[PDB]
Amino acid sequence: LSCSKNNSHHYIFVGNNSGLELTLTNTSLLNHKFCNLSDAHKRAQYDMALMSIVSTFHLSIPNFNQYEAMSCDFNGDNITVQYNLSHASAVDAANHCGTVANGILETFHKFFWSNNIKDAYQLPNQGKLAHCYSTSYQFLIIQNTTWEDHCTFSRPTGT
Ligand SMILES: *[C@@H]1O[C@H](CO)[C@@H](O)[C@H](O)[C@H]1NC(C)=O
Ligand SMILES: *[C@@H]1O[C@H](CO)[C@@H](O)[C@H](O)[C@H]1NC(C)=O
Ligand SMILES: *[C@@H]1O[C@H](CO)[C@@H](O)[C@H](O)[C@H]1NC(C)=O
Ligand SMILES: *[C@@H]1O[C@H](CO)[C@@H](O)[C@H](O)[C@H]1NC(C)=O
Ligand SMILES: *[C@@H]1O[C@H](CO)[C@@H](O)[C@H](O)[C@H]1NC(C)=O
């Protein structure tokens, strides 16, 4: 379940009956390291998902040429994105500051959706103060799912 006491979670409405469930968790959903966006249609569903999060959360992601370890999978049109977060220490957070995952951590922290996030490091970048968040959560999961089902993980791939 996304809505478990050992998790932290939030739902974003994006469509008419669609949205994104965001879950900080220690349960891995995707146990492969790849994210196959060879399909231009899948590339488009991936970009739209990340775009909805950035715009809904008014994120400004600093450009540190950094990257969050990540995999994805599709169940029909439903996307699953998993980040394997490198945010355990203040220095890990700093080295993973310019990522969408960090901006999501920033948002969970800002709105008290988790007690397990710290603003661990700040640094000037292009005239703005970037904040880099540490968390003990190992994974951040993004799934396209409905409000009615947002508390239950969807199956990452079909059968
Ligand atoms: C998740 O795992 C990390 C790393 O082992 C641990 O420090 C943390 O307490 C765990 N969080 C929960 C909610 O179990
Ligand atoms: C979190 O709690 C749920 C429900 O008790 C359990 O199924 C799950 O295994 C727990 N998470 C981890 C990482 O053990
Ligand atoms: C994330 O961690 C899981 C479990 O440790 C692993 O199976 C998976 O390959 C990892 N994914 C990435 C993108 O590193
Ligand atoms: C979520 O899935 C529905 C179909 O299940 C799809 O129409 C919609 O575009 C998806 N949302 C995205 C990709 O943001
Ligand atoms: C995808 O998600 C939609 C709602 O988000 C759901 O109705 C559907 O059963 C899911 N799976 C597939 C294969 O479309």
Author numbering: 82 to 240
From the paper:
The GP1 subunit of the envelope-displayed arenaviral glycoprotein spike complex (GPC) mediates host cell recognition and is an important determinant of cross-species transmission. Maturation of the GPC precursor involves proteolytic cleavage of the polyprotein into a retained and myristoylated stable signal peptide (SSP), a GP1 attachment glycoprotein, and a membrane-anchored GP2 fusion glycoprotein (1–5). We solved the crystal structures of the GP1 glycoproteins from Loei River virus (LORV), an Asiatic rodent-borne OW arenavirus of unknown pathogenicity in humans, and Whitewater Arroyo virus (WWAV), an NW arenavirus associated with spillover into human populations in North America. Both WWAV and LORV GP1s were solved at neutral pH (7.5 to 8.0) and acidic pH (5.6 to 5.0), permitting the first direct analysis of the effect of pH on the structure of GP1 in the absence of cognate GP2.
